[PDB]
């Protein structure tokens, strides 16, 4: 449970940042934050959102200073984590990101078309992560062009992204809406919860139906229809769209009470578990019955093998790989341990006890996550419970309180609280991976894709980034290329005109690990990271005439304070 | 050392974020981050830098997405922390911020005129914090208007800000430059290091002189000259400027080797200690000799009562209140405990031993900070050492590594490492305060200054913020006022035209602690916090015609997912 100085954590944890927009890398079981990976936020330090390279990745037709990331998931090969990529949603500005786990940096951002608010996200497990599966939460008109605002004619879609290219593969129109999603251990099926079968905005409307549903997607049938050309398109997007509304070959709508929320696949591949939320239950769907259901051989509700009452406000379920499930009860403010097989007996009227233990948590739990739960190798060691209120649990810090991520030992029969982890607004889910499932680089190589655009521009200017310190004049544009070797930039002054569009490229020629440099231009609103063997750039408009200093903002050497230069801006 | 679940930390720590731009609130000795206070960064979650209230506080004539904050200090009454305000510098875009410690929010940002790169910052101690003292690091022409770029005619200034108004009080022109600063325990004196007596840009130039100096400011004389009207002004600023160059009544330039860096006041009020950096020394200046020096009764170097050799790269010194000092050695990667009285005897020629202990730290230490060191109540319990490299100390996370903030027990004769704390780029200094020295509010009062502007606009529109759900049209502006009680906004639909300038005001009517609401407009790049009894607002341009959902992004209730609404944008 404890990590001494000089000792390493046993697992990485990748935490969502919620509306703060980043991913946080923790060591488990120390629960210490090792790194922040900027995604949808703008990072003053590394310049994510400021650098040209990050801006290229972000794309889009407007700058967004925010995002809302909930659901981080790591790429799999044959149902085991492979450590290549992390993917996460953006509910705020309707995007999905991919993070490269070799350098812990975002490398792709995709805008999802003709939907709003990407919420649920999880990955194909088997045969490997070929698809990223994405829910859009909020129904909108199709197309959304202002000619018809009616809810009556508003819909959402389920989206599959090609994991390797990050281009959207296809979308499925559904009835109702989409909340959370998971995938099976064959590649054939994915499934999502719906809380708004009513397609309402008002609170009473969203709660009218006694049951909403889990919608199950026959990914095999969908992919085949898309391959055959049996699809349509919406609006300005060329993405293939198939229609899963009503009675469709692509979907099954299994009724589940009530405004259900989490959707979690058991690590033995047997079950999708929908969390009942307004219903004090979960609903256990037998994946091995879905083939029969897609042939209309059984009823929709025949796939339900258990629907146990657990307590008030079930939100999310996770697994120890020993046959138990752990479910957050938001209103009762507990985590409930229960046995799946015993709940199945109870549903059948063989009235065994199925609840093993309720542990109070502090306070109001959202997601929970057991170590390796999303893989075949679910190890039953650690359980993280991510609670949304902290009240009195930490020192007072004003009206805005931290969240509380609690680490619980589930290695034995009895859940035991070990650590209370204050966290800034606002983690949703997290994912734990063994140390040995991640392989990182300690320095860049000069062909790295993270500065492909810099190499391409340098070639146009005949600049050798590893060697040159040059000022290139291009009309109202100026490109400044500098090398850096601690504690010196290879250029200590340059001159431009007021209003010039200045781009500064810095290449870090240091080879020693951890010798990162920075670059900041005083009063010009720019900063960037340049780690060993990286190139990075920033663009800014030169301000009113005068001297402006630049300096290294990454303490790098005893002579760091002296690592700088001057930009001289002349009257045009 | 250890804080169990349900127990509280004994100290607050306020960490600088460096070029990440925020202040981080830690519990000590657990070393867990309790809260982030946005300052110069743009926070996707709370909307700091997006909300109208934060934008008014930031002011300026352009948006900055970045800052570089090093030096957090808390307001004092008679040399004891009083818990009212924290102040911090911005090196990147030449600002100073004040944080209100009742709500843990920035409330004032001041742009410092006619200087670049605010670095050193510390507070008046006695009789209380009336002044904030600020160093500007980089010499610039006066005025900085592009007519003369020469270093020969470039200078910097020391700045005093009125702590209560946050308006600049006066500035002092100096020779050389300014790095770090501290104040005495009378109010009369402040002092700064200089590393660039050469006023050079090139590295060899900045290290040419064997000695630079500590510049001591006679604050009493300066304030008198200003009150008498004996000052000038620079450029377009009305701030009073006095000239402390050369032989001046306002300054004394005590030679100190070599490119000295930290400047630290001992808690008995006896010494200013300059950290030698390129010289393996510190220089101990006796404050009780300064009156004699300002009457020319002693020589400049007669104020030096010790100049002990400690080791390679001394950067920052801190104090246990027992007569020992603790100095970071950046090159040797150690913290050195030494006895001040013995160093004075050694300087006098006595055959004595002033070094007590060298502890290896991991790796390359910058600032260090002992609990209550900046006050009379320096308690000698804890020492934080903030190191700039972490190498192998934490799990690998790519080319960019965390920093390492180490917690050391200094309560006894032997310094003992207790904890290694990974931190994101890049803390400089921190300040520790007892739990009982901070008094926070849990909910807002409706007269709070943090939404005075919202109140004034509501009044003009005839709106009662605590009761109204109204849409106000004013040309092409739309002001939308809503109340909120989780899980329902008081308005679930509103209509605007494409291109309208839409301002949404939300007033949180929940009264229970920790029931924070949020607000996000999908695809419009806005988010904001609304904590209990707060009002907050965001402004955005309505996009292309269509439906856009808004939702609460602060998990607030079991029905959080249903806390939404729609903005309907029509073609103009
Ligand atoms: Cu490069 Cu500090
Ligand atoms: Cu309001 Cu969640
Ligand atoms: Ca419903
Ligand atoms: Ca919360
Ligand atoms: Ca010098
Ligand atoms: Ca570092
Ligand atoms: Cl889920
Ligand atoms: Cl200092
Ligand atoms: Na099959
Ligand atoms: Na089958
Ligand atoms: Na099969």
Author numbering:
A (entry chain B), B (entry chain A): 63 to 634
Cite, word for word, the article reporting this structure.
Copper-containing nitrous oxide reductase catalyzes a 2-electron reduction of the green-house gas N2O to yield N2. It contains two metal centers, the binuclear electron transfer site CuA, and the unique, tetranuclear CuZ center that is the site of substrate binding. At the interface of both domains, the CuA site closely approaches the CuZ cluster of the other subunit to form a combined active site that is accessible via a hydrophobic substrate channel running along the subunit interface, with a water-filled cavity behind the CuZ cluster.
Hypothesizing that many reported discrepancies in the structural data may be due to radiation damage during data collection, we determined the structure of anoxically isolated Marinobacter nauticus N2OR from diffraction data obtained with low-intensity X-rays from an in-house rotating anode generator and an image plate detector. Diffraction data from a plate-like single crystal of MnN2OR were collected using Cu Kα radiation (λ = 1.5418 Å) on a rotating anode X-ray generator with a mar345dtb image plate detector at a temperature of 100 K. The crystal belonged to the triclinic space group P1 and diffracted beyond the detector edge at the minimal possible crystal-to-detector distance, yielding data to 1.5 Å resolution with a mean I/σ(I) of 2.6 in the highest resolution shell. The two N2OR dimers of the asymmetric unit indeed differed in the conformation of residue H579, which was a ligand to CuA1 in the A protomer of both dimers (IN conformation), but rotated toward S546 in protomer B (OUT-conformation). Contrary to the IN- and OUT-conformations of the CuA sites, the four individual observations of CuZ were indistinguishable in the low-dose structure, where CuZ consistently was a [4Cu: 2S] site, with a largely symmetric Cu2S2 diamond core that is reminiscent of CuA. In the present analysis of MnN2OR, the Ca2+ site was fully defined and showed a typical coordination environment that in essence was octahedral but included two bidentate ligands, E260 and D274. The second ion-binding site in N2OR thus holds a K+ ion that plays a very specific role in connecting the CuA and CuZ sites, integrating them into a single functional active site within N2OR. Our analysis of the anomalous scattering properties of all ion sites supports an assignment as Cl– rather than S2–, but its influence on the properties of CuZ—if any—remains to be understood.
